[PDB]
Design a protein around this ligand. Structure first.
Ligand SMILES: *N(NC(=O)c1cc(-c2ccccc2)cc(C)c1F)S(=O)(=O)c1ccccc1
Ligand SMILES: [Cl-]
Ligand code: NA
Ligand SMILES: [Zn+2]
Length: 264
């Protein structure tokens, strides 16, 4: 059988996809995951015992972002291999296209948590190649179901671009995108580009945002805001055009004052 349900934190979550946990774990109907160290367990009793023993109350690695109770940890897959493998196995339950789970050393992982008196509770993550020949600033990106469509995914997208800006580079998420990921990027790109235009060339926008010119152009095309002239895309916008594609949920926001981070 496959794993079809997990318990993590105070949540029970149904699986969306196969994930290659060991077949004894895989063969269990339901796995129990420590929300802090991501150990996966077969039984309610081993889970309860672990909860009393585990000393971790947050992800490992460097806390590279903290604003109020919103935290991002940067975890090197070479330095916390087991944790990152466990994270990839969790993620694969909700990602069709992810293929990499155990060979985590080439990646850095950015773990989003929401903190309270008990600890830092995992919401989602994105992985990123330490070296990306293709200029991908996100490899895989996943928000756990109870947190989806609540602003956390937008925060991670914005975060991934704040890192690209700090690296003085453009970047794009690796394809294929999940169905929820594609909707979210398009919405993020639209909002960011429109907010800027309302407040410019395609190249200007790319330098300001670290969004690739390709993603800028495809977004503007869906907004019907580019013309084509002798082989070149060119922005074509007016206020009624801009301001009527913006006219609601206040985002979490990435406050670059609260980001502790320099390029590798
Ligand atoms: N809505 N978006 C998300 O929650 C979200 C979800 C996922 C994802 C989860 C599980 C499996 C596959 C994908 C991926 C991304 C990138 C994502 F954003 S939202 O956070 O409220 C939002 C995002 C962007 C613009 C507006 C709202
Ligand atoms: Cl569920
Ligand atoms: Na018993
Ligand atoms: Zn634990």
């Amino acid at each position: 059988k496959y794993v079809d349900k997990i318990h993590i934190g105070n949540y029970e979550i149904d699986a969306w996809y196969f994930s290659p946990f060991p077949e004894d774990y895989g063969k269990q109907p339901k796995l129990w995951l420590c929300e802090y160290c991501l150990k996966y367990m077969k039984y309610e009793k081993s889970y309860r015992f672990h909860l009393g023993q585990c000393q971790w109350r947050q992800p490992p690695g460097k806390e590279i972002y903290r604003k109020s109770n919103i935290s991002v940890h940067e975890v090197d897959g070479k330095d916390h291999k087991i944790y990152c493998q466990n994270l990839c196995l969790l993620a694969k339950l909700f990602l069709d296209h992810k293929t990499l789970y155990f060979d985590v050393e080439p990646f850095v992982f950015y773990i989003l948590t929401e903190v309270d008196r008990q600890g830092a509770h995992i919401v989602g993550y994105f992985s990123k190649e330490k070296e990306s020949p293709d200029g991908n600033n996100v490899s895989c990106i996943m928000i756990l179901p109870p947190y989806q469509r609540r602003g956390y995914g937008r925060f991670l997208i914005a975060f991934s671009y704040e890192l690209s800006k700090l690296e003085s580079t453009v970047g794009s998420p690796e394809k294929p995108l999940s169905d929820l990921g594609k909707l979210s990027y398009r919405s993020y790109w639209s909002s960011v580009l429109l907010e800027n235009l309302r407040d410019l060339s395609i190249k200007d926008l790319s330098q300001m945002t670290s969004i690739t010119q390709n993603d800028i152009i495809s977004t503007l095309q869906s907004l019907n805001m580019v013309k084509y002239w002798k082989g070149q895309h060119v922005i074509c916008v007016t206020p009624k055009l801009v301001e009527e594609h913006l006219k609601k949920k206040p985002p979490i926001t990435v406050d670059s004052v609260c980001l502790k981070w320099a390029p590798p």
